[PDB]
Write a protein that binds this DNA or RNA. Sequence first.
RNA 1: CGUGGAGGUCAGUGACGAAGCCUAGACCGUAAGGUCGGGUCGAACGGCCUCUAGUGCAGAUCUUGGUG
RNA 2: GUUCCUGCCGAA
RNA 3: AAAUUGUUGAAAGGGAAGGGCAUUUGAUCAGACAUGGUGU
Lengths: 173, 514, 78
Amino acid sequence: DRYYRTLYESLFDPRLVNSSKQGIYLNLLYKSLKQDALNVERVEAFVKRILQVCSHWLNVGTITGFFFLLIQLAKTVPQIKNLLTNWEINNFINHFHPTVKTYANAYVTGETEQIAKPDLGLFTLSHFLDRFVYRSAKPVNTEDWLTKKVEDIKPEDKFFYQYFTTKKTADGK
Amino acid sequence: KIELSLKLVRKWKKQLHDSPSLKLLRNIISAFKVAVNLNKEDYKYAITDEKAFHELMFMVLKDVPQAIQKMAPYKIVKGARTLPNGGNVSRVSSIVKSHAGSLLILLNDITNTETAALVLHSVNELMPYLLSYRRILKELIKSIVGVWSTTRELETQIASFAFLINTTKEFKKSMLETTLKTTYSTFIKSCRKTNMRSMPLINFQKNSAAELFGIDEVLGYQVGFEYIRQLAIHLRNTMNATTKKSSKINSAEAYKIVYNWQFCHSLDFWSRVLSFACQPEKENGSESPLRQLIYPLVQVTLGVIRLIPTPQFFPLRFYLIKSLIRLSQNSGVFIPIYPLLSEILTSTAFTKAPKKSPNLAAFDFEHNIKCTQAYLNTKIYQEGLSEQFVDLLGDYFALYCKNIAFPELVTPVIISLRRYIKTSTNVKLNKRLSTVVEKLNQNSTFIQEKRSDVEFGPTNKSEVSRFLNDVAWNKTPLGSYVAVQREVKEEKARLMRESMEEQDKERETEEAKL
Amino acid sequence: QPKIGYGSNKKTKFLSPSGHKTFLVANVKDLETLTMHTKTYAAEIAHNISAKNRVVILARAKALGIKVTNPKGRLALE
RNA sequence: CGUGGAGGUCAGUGACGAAGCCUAGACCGUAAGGUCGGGUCGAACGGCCUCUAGUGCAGAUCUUGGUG
RNA sequence: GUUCCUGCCGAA
RNA sequence: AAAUUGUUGAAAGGGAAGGGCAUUUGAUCAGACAUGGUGU
Ligand SMILES: [Mg+2]
Ligand SMILES: [Mg+2]
Ligand SMILES: [Mg+2]
Ligand SMILES: [Mg+2]
Ligand SMILES: [Mg+2]
């Protein structure tokens, strides 16, 4: 009980927002909540507070991580879905990041098959710049976007697709 | 060499109104060319009488287009003014091609509103011939954008931009891919040095160029997405340059490249553009391409805000923060901005007591980007920084003032604020932070009491968007507070302008007696 | 190594690539000294001039038809 | 060429930003440097005629603090 | 110890 | 106040960070004769 009390407390630790080690914290949260499947009220309380904390973060990879965890914790603990029928999720459905929006939509719809486990180091700002400058080299322009299946295209790159299919010309190089 | 006489101009005008011929047009245009090139350079004509010169300018700009139209009457096609096919049109087209850059020189030499209006009107009646050229149509749109960019008279800028709309909306094909480029390039390089004088003018320039991007849903997406990417390149160049050890260009002070007004002007103009295109009414239940650029713009802005968490550039953070708040207000996108604000609440200015108090003037947070090293660690600067910060929190959490999700949007913030309030030493800051805390709790209670009567769950988006549509946003405890605060801010700015304006008036008095 | 043999021709000395000798200008009165020598000389507004004066100098220079070497300086950047 | 001192002078320059400093930017001079642009700076100072002071480095004995 | 830059005249 | 030390955050990289050279692929900017006249 004391451990879960301290975890529920540390979820409101302000320093967590700027912590490099948020991934370890994500894994620890997943393991803890998985191990506590019997206490339905406690795990539901963690889910609510997790969304509370997520609403005020800037790191996308962490937020996608929490959403993926919640999706998976729903499988082990289906009673978590009762909260959606018995409020915060509306904000993440309207999140600026397309990937976060898709993850939230999948969690609400329950459509889990189209989710790969989010990977830290992806969705980070430097990675977005590396895509957006079009010169990664282990490029976005090199791939031909005239013919890519719409659903196949990842949510993160949709805007890229639009520009290329509008630009024609230097679409594929 | 023929000499301009008040007789000769009178005869040329005499026969202009009745039965003109191409010879007369070339003669008039050559005289016009000499007239406009007198200071800046063989010529068949010589100008000696101010009456003859003024009459030539008058008749040219006001009636040579009329005769040109009468000889080669254009026809309106699909809303566009298009010339017909024929030999006579081609001869007249070369004639307008021999008048165009005299109009360009006049455009480059505009100094007042009425001359701008006359030149622009005469240019207006000569589009359908000059659309056939690209040394002229480009320089035309480049020059009037130059006038729209450099004029200090709001009426001249209004005239230039109204011309840009009227000509652009007619044709949309040759010009529109150049108008947008020229305008936003103005916001890159030929940007006006900021000051309390230029703010309304640059605000008009931005609020105007925003409309042009919105006209063409697809083509705007083609343009802005490229130019915003240019910004990202600089953004990526400075981050790498500062971080890496290479002594190529200014590893330590690379902020100069990106922490400039021109760059902030860029990121503000883009937020305005997307906000304009993404408004709910213009959306009209129809997705627009510009919405997909919201994510790139937000990523760039957030990447700029966090690149330096130093007091010297807190004003820069505030401006982009207001821009993001505007974007979220118009589009409804959820921007996380509280993590940034609370992350600055650990600084040495928001936390440590003031060291000096020279009693300098209050800092112009709205119209400046930098602290200037004298306001650092001062009572005035801390008191003004916090004044801005508190109102920014008020705005951001006033966006969701009437939403059902506000309670849980408030809880993590009230807890963290009480943590900071209980540990912060500065008395004035704790008082201001406190006020926001209790009003946040109050609006949380308000929304809770209004939500206890709700039968639909979170999944029903339609009803969730209908919650308290009857209640005005300003009637909520955080609205009713912050709205009043906004007035208490807005009036202040007014009294600044209604003061600074008078200073110049007073200044004018002095040159009257000099 | 610098030396006198490298000296430039007198007819081409002190000439910008535009072909105009640069002359410093502080106010309108000093601008008007270059009224006719527009071919030989081009004006250059001093560093210490305020923005309000620079627009007046530019307007008068355009009226006189004298080339300004550094316009859009402190009214635009670079 | 550059640095100060004084007299005279430009009805000089200045919050619409003076002086100082930086500027792998543009122009000029063979060069010492000069002018402009930008940055920085945030309240006064500069150009010019005269007389008067007055140009950047090297190295040793070692000394002190501080770090092994 | 060296002695801002350029130039000039010049033994033995 | 410099000089110096430590925690936290971002980035790059590899056992050092590191440069110069070549090729490769790209992105992005500037690029007048507004040629004086005549002719149908
Ligand atoms: Mg200077
Ligand atoms: Mg003196
Ligand atoms: Mg210097
Ligand atoms: Mg040279
Ligand atoms: Mg890393």
